[PDB]
Design a binder for these strands. Structure first.
Ligand SMILES: [Cs+]
Ligand SMILES: [Cs+]
Ligand SMILES: [Cs+]
Ligand SMILES: [Cs+]
Ligand SMILES: [Cs+]
Ligand SMILES: [Cs+]
Ligand SMILES: [Cs+]
Ligand SMILES: [Cs+]
Lengths: 123, 121
DNA sequence: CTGTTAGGCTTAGGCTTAG
DNA sequence: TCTAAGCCTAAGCCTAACA
């Protein structure tokens, strides 16, 4: 019944969220924890820690639908982007594969599910 | 050049009567009607054979028809029923216009939705 | 298995550009 | 210093199948 107002996700929101995800993945690799950013528990924790104004379910849906397809265009270091693509399970179509290989000077190995199997930093 | 065709008063009358009947049916079924969605207008376009698309209808209803409902050539009982059972905001100016045109006193809530009205006739 | 995580619906809000 | 067809995206939240 209540008429809702909607606030967009900003570029700064994406920078903060992606850096959070990267650091938590690195620490989880050191400690042996498997984090799942496409779940909801990760975003429960993110919302508690950052005290975001947005809900965890909203963050999960948005991350899966908007942030993951746009990760390769983020204003982030290319090594960070490649680590995230390799360790999160983000689809990369053929055209995007070529675009990434060209703009990052890398060699991608992408599977039949279009997930990133591996990469070589050819620089 | 894409020619555009305005919604007519007849379009609005048929759409509002359809919405009224669907609201009555939803009340009897105990379900919530969602005329600002898309499925409702898919069903409407199918039933009425209107030549405009469902997405066009949904946008138009939300943005044009709801703010203009009080000006419709419909019985004020139906207009006030629709205002009461659809999320339609009523600002102070529109509230006064309604009270004068229909000879009623409106009780409008903090969400600027119609709570109730008293017929002064 | 209860968390993950695809996919559906509403409807708020943006773009293009005809009237 | 326009309004709003015509269509769209996606915020926001949800469900449901699979593991
Ligand atoms: Cs914050
Ligand atoms: Cs991957
Ligand atoms: Cs209402
Ligand atoms: Cs599980
Ligand atoms: Cs799943
Ligand atoms: Cs748009
Ligand atoms: Cs116009
Ligand atoms: Cs579902």
């Amino acid at each position: 019944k209540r008429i809702e107002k909607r606030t967009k996700f900003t570029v700064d929101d994406h920078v903060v969220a992606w850096k959070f995800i990267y650091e938590k993945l690195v620490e989880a690799d050191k400690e042996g924890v498997q984090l799942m950013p496409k779940g909801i528990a990760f975003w429960n924790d993110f919302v508690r820690v950052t005290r975001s104004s947005k809900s965890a379910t909203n963050w999960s849906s948005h991350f899966r639908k908007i942030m993951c397809p746009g990760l390769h265009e983020m204003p982030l270091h290319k090594k960070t982007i490649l680590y995230l693509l390799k360790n999160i399970g983000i689809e990369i179509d053929k055209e995007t594969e070529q675009i990434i290989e060209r703009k990052f000077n890398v060699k991608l190995l992408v599977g039949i599910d279009r997930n990133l199997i591996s990469y070589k930093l050819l620089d």
